[PDB]
Structure formats: structure tokens, C-alpha cells
């Protein structure tokens, strides 16, 4: 008592854990739909097959999708099965018939896998080379801005109509570019030496800029600068200091 009651009032904590869930609400078919269809089915004699699910609430799905897309990993909604994030279907919203839910979270999960893989790569750097390191640095530089916007949206779900289709639509011209990066980098991560494994990546970069040469061009440019930055430094050094110094034969011109 007295902390438990304080909890029960101003805190919810019952839908991302194994507790019964309710939400105070005013049903009447347009938002009771899933239960309406369930009762229709049960009257229709399926035969039975119970629909025991824990009932998730609505706005908090929107908290989960902002968190997944922003860059942090491992949520309640959106679990992994082999290391690739996918929708869980053990939760039910009062409406949507539980089939639209699987689709909408599947497409958002398709974005979430893209950010999941990149954040996995960047986390496995902090637990010579200087190019992949120089590329994850540029990727992180884009990532902090991308995360800031989605976090800024997340604050107003504490501070306003709440629906799925607006918060995805507001992020459409970022989630478009997010898919492009997943194809540009995947061909620059294919493949031994630290100079071959940099060369196919950089050549992929210079080739993929000319394809789009909107907004995506500036996105690939901001990554281009921060990977050619080591090379130009050692080139300048080779000019004025005369000798070529690039340790472990990182320079593509054999000295």
C-alpha cells in the first residue's frame, strides 16, 4: 500500500508484461470491431478456438514504433526470431480485426530491420583500419539527427489525436532514404585486406552518387566526405612532406 496505489493511479505498467489489460473507453462498433467480428464468428460456430490475447492499448504502439525506428534496439512489441525484428501477433487492439495490425507492423518492422542492422554494426565497433571506422562515424552523424526528430515526436505522447497513419506519413521522406542506404552499403560490405574491403565500398559510393545525381544525393554526399577525408589528408602529406606515409599499406597506390 501507498506506493502501490500511487502506481495504480498514475502509472499503467500492465500491457508490455503478463498482466490483464483494460483501458477506460466508450466502445460501439467503429472501435470495438475486432470483438464484434469475434462475436460474429463465435455465433457462426467456427467451432470454438479461443482468442486468448492480452489486449494491447492504442497510443503505446505508437510509442513502440517511435522507439524502434529511432535507433534503440530490443522492445516488447517487435521481437526478433533469428536476429531479424518482426511483429508479434499475441497482442490485440480493440479494433482493426487483428489482421490490419499484422500488416502495418510488418511494414514498420521492415524499416526496423534496416536500422537494427546498422546500429548492430556501430555498436560492435566500441564493443589500423580508419575507413569503416570513418564510415560508421558518418553513419552515426546522420543517426543522431534522425533519432532526435523521432524522440521529439515521442515527447508529445507524454505532453493530441493519436493514430498510426499520421506518424508514419510524417516520416515518409526519411524512411524513403533509409531504404536507399540499406542497398548502397550492402554492396560496400560484401568483401580480405583492409584496402580491398575499403576499395569496393568507396567505388560503390562514387558510383551510387552518380545514379541519383532530390534529397537522397545530399544523404550519400554527407557519407562520401567522411570516408574520403583520410585519403586526402595522406595525399596532402605525400605532397608536402614528400614521403608517402600510410601505415599497414592502406593507400591504394602501391608505394
Amino acid at each position: 500500500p501507498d506506493d502501490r496505489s500511487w502506481l495504480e493511479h498514475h502509472v499503467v505498467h500492465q500491457y508490455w508484461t503478463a498482466r490483464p489489460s483494460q483501458f477506460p473507453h466508450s466502445l460501439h462498433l467503429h472501435s470495438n470491431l475486432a470483438a464484434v467480428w469475434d462475436q460474429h464468428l463465435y455465433s457462426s460456430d467456427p467451432l470454438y478456438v479461443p482468442d486468448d490475447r492480452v489486449l494491447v492499448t492504442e497510443t503505446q504502439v505508437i510509442r513502440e514504433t517511435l522507439w524502434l525506428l529511432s535507433g534503440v534496439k530490443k522492445l516488447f512489441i517487435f521481437q526478433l526470431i533469428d536476429g531479424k525484428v518482426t511483429v508479434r501477433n499475441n497482442i490485440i487492439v480493440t479494433h482493426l480485426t487483428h489482421s490490419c495490425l499484422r500488416s502495418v507492423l510488418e511494414q514498420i518492422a521492415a524499416y526496423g530491420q534496416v536500422v537494427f542492422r546498422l546500429q548492430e554494426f556501430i555498436d560492435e565497433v566500441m564493443g589500423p583500419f580508419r575507413t569503416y571506422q570513418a564510415f560508421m562515424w558518418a553513419l552515426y552523424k546522420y543517426f543522431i539527427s534522425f533519432k532526435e526528430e523521432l524522440a521529439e515526436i515521442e515527447k508529445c505522447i507524454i505532453n493530441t489525436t493519436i493514430t498510426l497513419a499520421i506518424v508514419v506519413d510524417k516520416l515518409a521522406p526519411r524512411l524513403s532514404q533509409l531504404k536507399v542506404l540499406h542497398k548502397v552499403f550492402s554492396t560496400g560490405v560484401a568483401e580480405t585486406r583492409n584496402v580491398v574491403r575499403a576499395s569496393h565500398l568507396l567505388n560503390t559510393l562514387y558510383k551510387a552518387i552518380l545514379e541519383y545525381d532530390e534529397q537522397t544525393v545530399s544523404l550519400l554526399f554527407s557519407l562520401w566526405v567522411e570516408t574520403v577525408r583520410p585519403y586526402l589528408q595522406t595525399v596532402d602529406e605525400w605532397i608536402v612532406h614528400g614521403h608517402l606515409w600510410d601505415g599497414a599499406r592502406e593507400f591504394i597506390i602501391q608505394r
Partner: protein
Amino acid sequence: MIHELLLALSGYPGSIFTWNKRSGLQVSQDFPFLHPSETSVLNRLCRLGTDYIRFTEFIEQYTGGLHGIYLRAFCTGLDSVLQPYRQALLDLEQEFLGDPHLSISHVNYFLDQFQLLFPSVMVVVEQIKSQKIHGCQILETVYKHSCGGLPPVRSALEKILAVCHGVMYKQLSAWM
């Protein structure tokens, strides 16, 4: 009902309106509480969402064979013609949150103006694949449909056609 539908017509159809690539948003579910003839009303409405889904797929896939940034200028204009189709999906949700006194009929009525815009641009999407255009002859096949005979398909292709000029004025300005 009118939250499921206003996403079913959008890019998330669900299982009451099952997607098909031959005629999507199929519905033959038995509703006791709806009227028996409501299925036909729904079919007339399903005409809208099938075309919007088809357009999104076309924008997805293409962005000798197909190459160029022209397929990122045709599809890019196809975005901007659909922008008052998204806002006008939001307005209905806003009304429907408060008033339950409106029904399926108001959705059918308010969004009947794209059941002319959508099919007459559907022939434009099928023509470019049936007879292959991916190149610099895209402006040719659109500039003759842009004259039109009906006003919505007169304005839509104009909006796309400006973006199509944007690529050729890179070619013909770097040239000259």
C-alpha cells in the same frame, strides 16, 4: 469499422478487404448487422483503394531494360497527384472520431471524385509497360494524354509532367 476501412483503402488492407492483384480488396464476408445489399456499395467503394495500392507498387519497384532517373520523375509526380488523396483520408477520420451518425455512404460520396481520376490514369500505367517506354520518349506519351477530355486527368498529368521536364533540363542544360 471506419477506422479499419480508412486504412484498408490505404496501404494496409487487412483480411476483411483481402488484396488481389487481379481485383483487390475482395469482400464477401457475411455481416449480420449490415444490410444484405451493403456488399455492392462496398464493391463500388473498393474500386478506389485497389488503384491507390497499384500506384504505390509502381512507385516502389522502379526507383535495353529500365534505367535512368526518369523512373524517379514519373513516379515522383505520381506522389504529388496522390497528396490530396492522403489529406482527404485524414479529414474523414477526424469527422468520424466524434460523429458516429455518418456511415459508409459519406466515404463513398466524398471520395467519388477519384473513381474517375484513378481509372483514367490506370491506362497510363498499363500503356508504358505493354509498349515499353523507360527512356526519353516518356514525355511524348504523356504530352498527348495531357490534353485530355475530362478535367481531373487534365490536371494530374500536368503535375507529373513538370517533374518529367526536370530531368531533360539537366541534360539540355549540361549540353548547351
